[PDB]
Amino acid sequence: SGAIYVGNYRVVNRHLATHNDWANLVWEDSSRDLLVSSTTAQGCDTIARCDCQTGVYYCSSRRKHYPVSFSKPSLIFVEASEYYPARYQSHLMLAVGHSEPGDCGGILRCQHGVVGIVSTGGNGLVGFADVRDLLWLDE
Ligand SMILES: C#C[C@H](NCCc1cocn1)c1nn(C)c2ccccc12
Ligand SMILES: [Zn+2]
């Protein structure tokens, strides 16, 4: 579980969005596993605006923050889960690291701010949904 809170926006994994998020929907992309909903209070997370490939992610299944190298956002074939069939997930970055379903929403951060959230995993890899291209989160 987990979310990014920036301005009057809440960024969550689409497969973990609640009743309240869908009713106050701003934007959603199934292929990215992202959903943004409006909020009444202002958030304090800063979104990174960079092309960093090193950062630190939070892994709740280990209660630990791990430093990782990650690939640039791409279109990657992801195996079927209970939430989506087997498909090409877009704007996805991979790192060698531990992750379990319940780790989705864990933040990946660089020196410039929030890079993305845990969205996929398996075979000793963790996948993060990039949010650095969503420039409208800043305004
Ligand atoms: C099921 C599930 C989770 N993905 C749901 C979202 C999704 C499905 O396809 C593309 N995205 C998952 N996230 N992590 C970090 C895992 C690690 C190991 C095994 C599964 C997972
Ligand atoms: Zn950065």
Q: What is the distance between the alpha carbons of residues 109 and 82, in angstroms, rounded to a whole number?
A: 27
Helix (H, G, I), strand (E, B) or coil at 11: strand
Taking the C-alpha atoms of residue 116 and residue 55, their distance in angstroms, rounded to an integer, is 10
Which pairing describes strands 64-69 and 125-130: parallel, antiparallel, or unpaired? unpaired
Enumerate the H helices of 5-136 as residue ranges: 19-23
Resolution at which this structure was determined, Å: 1.6
| Ligand 2 centroid distance, CA of 82 (Å) | 32
Structure tokens belonging to residue 10: 């809440």
Residue among 27, 30, 31 at smallest CA distance from 9: 27
Active site residue 103: no
Q: Whose CA is nearest to atom 3 of ligand 1?
A: 101
Residue among 31, 35, 47 at smallest CA distance from 84 = 31
Buried/exposed 50-59: b ≥16 CB within 10 Å, e otherwise: eebeebebbb
Residue 50, annotated as binding a ligand: yes
Residue nearest (by alpha carbon) to ligand 1 atom 2 = 101
Place of tokens 């969005």: 17
Report helix, strand or coil for 103: helix
Tokens standing for residue 21: 């998020």
Nearest one of 44, 16, 63 to 114, comparing CA atoms: 44
Cα 129 to Cα 64: distance, rounded to the nearest angstrom: 20
CB-based contact 11:131 (threshold 8 Å): yes
Q: In what order do the strands lie in the sheet with 113-122?
A: 64-69, 54-59, 107-110, 113-122, 125-130, 87-96, 74-78
What is the rounded end-to-end Cα distance, in angstroms, of the chain? 25
Contacts of 23 (CB under 8 A, 6+ apart): none
The Å distance, Cα 93 to ligand 1 centre, comes to 13
